[PDB]
Amino acid sequence: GPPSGKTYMGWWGHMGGPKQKGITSYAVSPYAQKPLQGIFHNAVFNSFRRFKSQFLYVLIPAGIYWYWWKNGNEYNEFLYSKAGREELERVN
Amino acid sequence: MAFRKSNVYLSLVNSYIIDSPQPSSINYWWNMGSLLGLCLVIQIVTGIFMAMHYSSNIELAFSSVEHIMRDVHNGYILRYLHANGASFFFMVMFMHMAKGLYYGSYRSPRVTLWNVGVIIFILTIATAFLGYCCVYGQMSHWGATVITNLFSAIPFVGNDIVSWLWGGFSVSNPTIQRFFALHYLVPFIIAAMVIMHLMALHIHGSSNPLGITGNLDRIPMHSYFIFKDLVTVFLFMLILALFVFYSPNTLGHPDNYIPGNPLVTPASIVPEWYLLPFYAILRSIPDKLLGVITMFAAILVLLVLPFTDRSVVRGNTFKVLSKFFFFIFVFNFVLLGQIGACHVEVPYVLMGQIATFIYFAYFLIIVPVISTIENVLFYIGRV
Amino acid sequence: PQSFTSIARIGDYILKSPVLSKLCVPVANQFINLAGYKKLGLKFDDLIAEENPIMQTALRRLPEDESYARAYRIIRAHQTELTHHLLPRNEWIKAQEDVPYLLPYILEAEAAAKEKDELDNIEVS
Amino acid sequence: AEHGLHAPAYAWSHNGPFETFDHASIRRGYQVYREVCAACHSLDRVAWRTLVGVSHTNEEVRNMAEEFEYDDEPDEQGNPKKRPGKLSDYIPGPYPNEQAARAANQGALPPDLSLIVKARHGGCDYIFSLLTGYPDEPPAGVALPPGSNYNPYFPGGSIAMARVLFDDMVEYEDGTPATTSQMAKDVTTFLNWCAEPEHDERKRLGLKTVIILSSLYLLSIWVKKFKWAGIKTRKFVFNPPKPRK
Amino acid sequence: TGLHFGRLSLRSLTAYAPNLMLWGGASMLGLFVFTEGWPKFQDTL
Ligand code: HEC
Ligand code: HEM
Ligand code: HEM
Ligand SMILES: COc1c(O)c(C)c(C/C=C(\C)CC/C=C(\C)CC/C=C(\C)CC/C=C(\C)CC/C=C(\C)CCC=C(C)C)c(O)c1OC
Ligand SMILES: CCCCCCCCCCCCCCC(=O)O[C@H](COC(=O)CCCCCCCCCCCC)COP(=O)(O)O
Numbered sequence: 051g052p053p054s055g056k057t058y059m060g061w062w063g064h065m066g067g068p069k070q071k072g073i074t075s076y077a078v079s080p081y082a083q084k085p086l087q088g089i090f091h092n093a094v095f096n097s098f099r100r101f102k103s104q105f106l107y108v109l110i111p112a113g114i115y116w117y118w119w120k121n122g123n124e125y126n127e128f129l130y131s132k133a134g135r136e137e138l139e140r141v142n
Numbered sequence: 143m144a145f146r147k148s149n150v151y152l153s154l155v156n157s158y159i160i161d162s163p164q165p166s167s168i169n170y171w172w173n174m175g176s177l178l179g180l181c182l183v184i185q186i187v188t189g190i191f192m193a194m195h196y197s198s199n200i201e202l203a204f205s206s207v208e209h210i211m212r213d214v215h216n217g218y219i220l221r222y223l224h225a226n227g228a229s230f231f232f233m234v235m236f237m238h239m240a241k242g243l244y245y246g247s248y249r250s251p252r253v254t255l256w257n258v259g260v261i262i263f264i265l266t267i268a269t270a271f272l273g274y275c276c277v278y279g280q281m282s283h284w285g286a287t288v289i290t291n292l293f294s295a296i297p298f299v300g301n302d303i304v305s306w307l308w309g310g311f312s313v314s315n316p317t318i319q320r321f322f323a324l325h326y327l328v329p330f331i332i333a334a335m336v337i338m339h340l341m342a343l344h345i346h347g348s349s350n351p352l353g354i355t356g357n358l359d360r361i362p363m364h365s366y367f368i369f370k371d372l373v374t375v376f377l378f379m380l381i382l383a384l385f386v387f388y389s390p391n392t393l394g395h396p397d398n399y400i401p402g403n404p405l406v407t408p409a410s411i412v413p414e415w416y417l418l419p420f421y422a423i424l425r426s427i428p429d430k431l432l433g434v435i436t437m438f439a440a441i442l443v444l445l446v447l448p449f450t451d452r453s454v455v456r457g458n459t460f461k462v463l464s465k466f467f468f469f470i471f472v473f474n475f476v477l478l479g480q481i482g483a484c485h486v487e488v489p490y491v492l493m494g495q496i497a498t499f500i501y502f503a504y505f506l507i508i509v510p511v512i513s514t515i516e517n518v519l520f521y522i523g524r525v
Numbered sequence: 526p527q528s529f530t531s532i533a534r535i536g537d538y539i540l541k542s543p544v545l546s547k548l549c550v551p552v553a554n555q556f557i558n559l560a561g562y563k564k565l566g567l568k569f570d571d572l573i574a575e576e577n578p579i580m581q582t583a584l585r586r587l588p589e590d591e592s593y594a595r596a597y598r599i600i601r602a603h604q605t606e607l608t609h610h611l612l613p614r615n616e617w618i619k620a621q622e623d624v625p626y627l628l629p630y631i632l633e634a635e636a637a638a639k640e641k642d643e644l645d646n647i648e649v650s
Numbered sequence: 651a652e653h654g655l656h657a658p659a660y661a662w663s664h665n666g667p668f669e670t671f672d673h674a675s676i677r678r679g680y681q682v683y684r685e686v687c688a689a690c691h692s693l694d695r696v697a698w699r700t701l702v703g704v705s706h707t708n709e710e711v712r713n714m715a716e717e718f719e720y721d722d723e724p725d726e727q728g729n730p731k732k733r734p735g736k737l738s739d740y741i742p743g744p745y746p747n748e749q750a751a752r753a754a755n756q757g758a759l760p761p762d763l764s765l766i767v768k769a770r771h772g773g774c775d776y777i778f779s780l781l782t783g784y785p786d787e788p789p790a791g792v793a794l795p796p797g798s799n800y801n802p803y804f805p806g807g808s809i810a811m812a813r814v815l816f817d818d819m820v821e822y823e824d825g826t827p828a829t830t831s832q833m834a835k836d837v838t839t840f841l842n843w844c845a846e847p848e849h850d851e852r853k854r855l856g857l858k859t860v861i862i863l864s865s866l867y868l869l870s871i872w873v874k875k876f877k878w879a880g881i882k883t884r885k886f887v888f889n890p891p892k893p894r895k
Numbered sequence: 896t897g898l899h900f901g902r903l904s905l906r907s908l909t910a911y912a913p914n915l916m917l918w919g920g921a922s923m924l925g926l927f928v929f930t931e932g933w934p935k936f937q938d939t940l
Binding site: 055057058059060061062065066067068070107108111112114115118119122125126129130138141142 | 161163251345346347355357358360465466467469470472473474476477480487488489490493
Binding site: 058068069070072073100103 | 561576584592593595596597600609610
């Protein structure tokens with residue numbers, strides 16, 4: 051067949067990573083162990099852990115654009131209100 | 143060798159969905175791609191069986207969709223599964239386009255896989271827009287007029303292209319009858335671009351959330367990510383079943399149930415929720431020619447993103463400020479589609495300019511400078 | 526894409542300046558542990574992308590021992606990540622074990638490749 | 651003032667995931683359509699046969715469709731002749747062409763209500779609050795144009811549709827009191843049936859699909875975990891090889 | 896003794912410039928051929 055280019059992945063046998071030595075793996079057949087073994091204590095304690103870490107990365111970025119839209123919505127409500135047409139004519 | 147590897151036809155299936163080596167630590171954000179493949183089959187199959195009952199004439203276009211809903215056996219299942227699957231198609235695609243930008247999937251050596259995605263992104267917008275005018279609703283007539291009359295801003299040539307695209311002087315019978323024949327063609331082009339999309343994915347493979355090499359720990363695609371993809375398939379078909387049987391018309395707009403009228407305009411011409419944000423970018427510029435350039439650039443700005451990112455780490459996982467401004471840009475787009483829902487009134491015009499400015503500056507100023515200090519904080523913090 | 530020698534000449538100057546090394550280094554050290562890679566057992570230089578000919582050259586000059594250990598921290602992080610948990614507190618990376626073991630190899634490879642591109646465009650008088 | 655007053659959420663009997671239409675209200679709503687809003691509005695997308703087994707019996711519907719007339723194929727010499735309606739024909743509107751509708755109603759075009767429920771924002775709440783939302787006089791400050799009536803719920807305020815719902819203008823076949831609020835609750839039910847004649851079957855096929863899919867979704871999690879059990883608890887150890895080699 | 900470069904030399908851009916104008920001229924000739932019969936482009940045809 052025709053030759054091909056140079057990539058960053060191989061296949062089973064020549065995957066292309068570094069040579070490894072001195073690392074051992076153990077596993078057990080799933081017919082011999084019980085799944086669902088720790089679903090509780092993971093739905094409570096594990097989820098709370100992850101939440102407490104990544105929640106100020108989403109809240110403050112959502113805490114800025116909520117007060118920015120609200121002070122524009124409650125400002126647009128006064129500009130088109132009967133008490134805020136005089137400010138409307140100076141911005142229209 | 144085994145027959146699944148020796149046969150000419152079964153060896154392609156073997157190397158793509160069976161023996162393909164996957165990273166052992168990709169999370170549920172990597173299931174989004176197979177959901178788009180599932181949804182592409184849904185649109186086509188539910189479209190061929192629904193194309194057996196649709197007339198593309200301007201006289202019979204609207205009336206035939208009612209005949210599908212009232213006379214065809216399970217004809218309402220066909221049209222709600224096809225109208226809601228179009229809206230579910232874009233939500234999974236945004237979560238596929240956003241996971242790529244977070245974990246730095248656009249970076250080399252996967253730039254071609256990134257550019258083919260943008261081509262796929264455009265063709266799907268056109269395919270959804272073209273199929274939207276097929277119903278010939280009141281919103282589809284005026285969504286057709288506004289979008290097609292947009293190319294009248296190209297100097298000295300625009301007036302002929304618009305007349306060539308309409309097939310005449312406005313949106314009439316020659317327009318709808320050629321919009322439907324195109325709508326049947328483009329999905330076969332997307333299906334061909336997905337084949338080219340998976341061809342560029344196979345040279346280097348998928349990425350992992352850690353952003354590091356994944357060649358050290360691989361597991362086969364079959365029996366691990368075939369059964370993990372089955373978890374999200376059943377959850378996708380359950381949320382879709384709720385929007386089809388319990389609330390079919392929530393995502394759409396009620397004005398599309400009026401026959402299209404060329405004399406009376408609706409109270410508010412608004413696009414669907416997925417094209418809503420770019421509608422604000424178009425309307426922010428107080429000029430006609432400059433709006434088109436600004437509107438289309440927002441799609442094309444994604445193309446320079448492999449060059450602006452000056453970081454030696456892929457992703458936002460181990461970066462405090464690069465992960466920080468991402469969610470503002472996420473939300474700014476969420477805010478960007480909010481003004482487009484509101485009329486052109488004080489002070490939504492002023493919001494419309496600053497918000498679209500911060501949208502464009504993320505790619506061109508913040509991502510390059512924060513990514514720069516981050517290289518320095520990483521350097522002196524360890525030294 | 527912003528090279529590494531470019532951002533290192535920024536470093537050694539800030540380190541030597543007493544005013545700068547007192548103002549920002551006490552702010553940089555909180556940026557590292559807030560990033561939180563230490564808890565999965567990752568040295569910083571294991572985070573840099575390696576799919577370019579510059580890093581592939583330095584990864585070959587790396588000694589066997591530092592390449593075998595590097596293989597284990599990446600495997601441990603991949604295994605720990607798929608379980609949605611973290612490593613035990615007594616195995617995390619401390620402040621002193623996170624040393625620049627991949628720094629000199631990256632630097633000696635760019636200055637020999639900067640020389641190549643500056644010699645391909647010599648305009649002899 | 652120009653968006654139109656927001657209408658509240660009422661206690662419709664068919665809201666909720668398991669409720670069907672009250673088929674006694676579809677039978678009564680059809681009666682107040684034929685005598686109240688049949689004069690100025692059309693129903694062009696409703697065949698006669700769909701009423702059998704839903705609101706009326708088969709002999710009842712084969713007689714209602716025979717009071718009207720349809721144009722038949724020409725006779726032996728091409729002259730046109732008329733035929734009585736059958737169960738395969740549709741409900742005829744009151745006006746032959748769009749011009750004749752605008753003549754009787756002061757230029758306003760009265761819409762076709764076979765899809766009105768899914769075509770006016772406000773769903774079932776907007777049709778009900780329309781016909782009962784008329785004040786006795788317009789609010790202080792506004793002088794309406796001649797021939798137009800005020801109604802706050804209508805976006806923009808001024809509307810061209812009058813009041814048609816009074817008390818005891820219709821007599822029912824089951825003794826129900828004929829109040830303005832009673833009928834307005836019924837037509838919206840009959841009109842929602844016209845826009846969605848698949849209403850009941852859709853909501854019971856949904857219950858079958860959700861129960862099947864929700865247990866398939868749960869069974870898949872057990873099977874996913876059973877097959878992933880060998881990799882979830884896999885344990886690695888590292889012992890540095892000697893540097894002799 | 897060093898020329899301005901970005902993986903593309905300044906010396907090699909001036910050597911290709913006379914040919915780039917010739918290729919540009921060859922492209923306009925191909926435009927009039929393929930866009931003949933256009934009434935708007937017939938204003939200068
Ligand atoms: C007297 C004639 C008449 C009768 C009887 C009548 N309508 Fe109307 N209706 C009109 C006219 C005229 C209009 C058009 C007004 C316009 O849009 O301003 C209209 C408009 C409407 C609209 C459109 C409102 C919208 O927001 O565009 C609805 C819905 C409607 N009618 C429902 C009904 C229902 C329901 C009934 C009885 C069940 C009914 N009408 C009986 C004359 C009538
Ligand atoms: C990715 C592929 C496709 C997408 C995203 C798509 C999207 C759409 C959308 C949004 C509509 C309008 C839905 C509505 O609001 O009523 C539509 C209508 C339609 N589509 Fe498609 N479509 C796709 C493929 C196809 C194919 C392959 C066919 C036919 C072979 C087809 C046939 C139709 C028909 C006949 C209609 C009008 C019927 C109706 O909606 O009432 N579509 N399509
Ligand atoms: C029908 C449309 C599409 C299908 C079926 C599809 C399918 C896939 C699949 C199966 C993968 C590999 C699995 C995965 O990464 O989750 C993938 C990867 C990717 N796709 Fe798509 N895709 C589609 C559209 C797009 C679009 C529109 C974009 C960008 C705008 C895009 C960008 C990418 C990127 C960047 C990756 C690599 C992600 C990674 O390796 O981490 N794709 N796609
Ligand atoms: C990188 O990891 C991968 C990965 O490599 C792959 C391949 C997939 C799998 C995804 C795909 C291969 C998606 C592929 C999608 C397509 C190519 C779309 C398919 C399009 C078509 C089938 C074309 C349309 C043709 C038909 C269906 C015709 C049907 C015939 C009909 C309706 C006629 C019926 C009439 C009669 C007379 C009975 C993954 O999910 C994945 O991550 C888990
Ligand atoms: C492109 C659209 C789909 C995206 C790909 C997502 C992958 C899901 C495909 C489902 C195949 C899973 C079964 C594999 C198999 O044959 O295992 C077989 C037998 O397994 C079974 O018992 C089959 C279980 C039946 C579930 C199939 C339901 C299909 C749901 C529809 C999904 C597509 C619309 C091999 O089993 P093994 O693990 O011993 O090798």
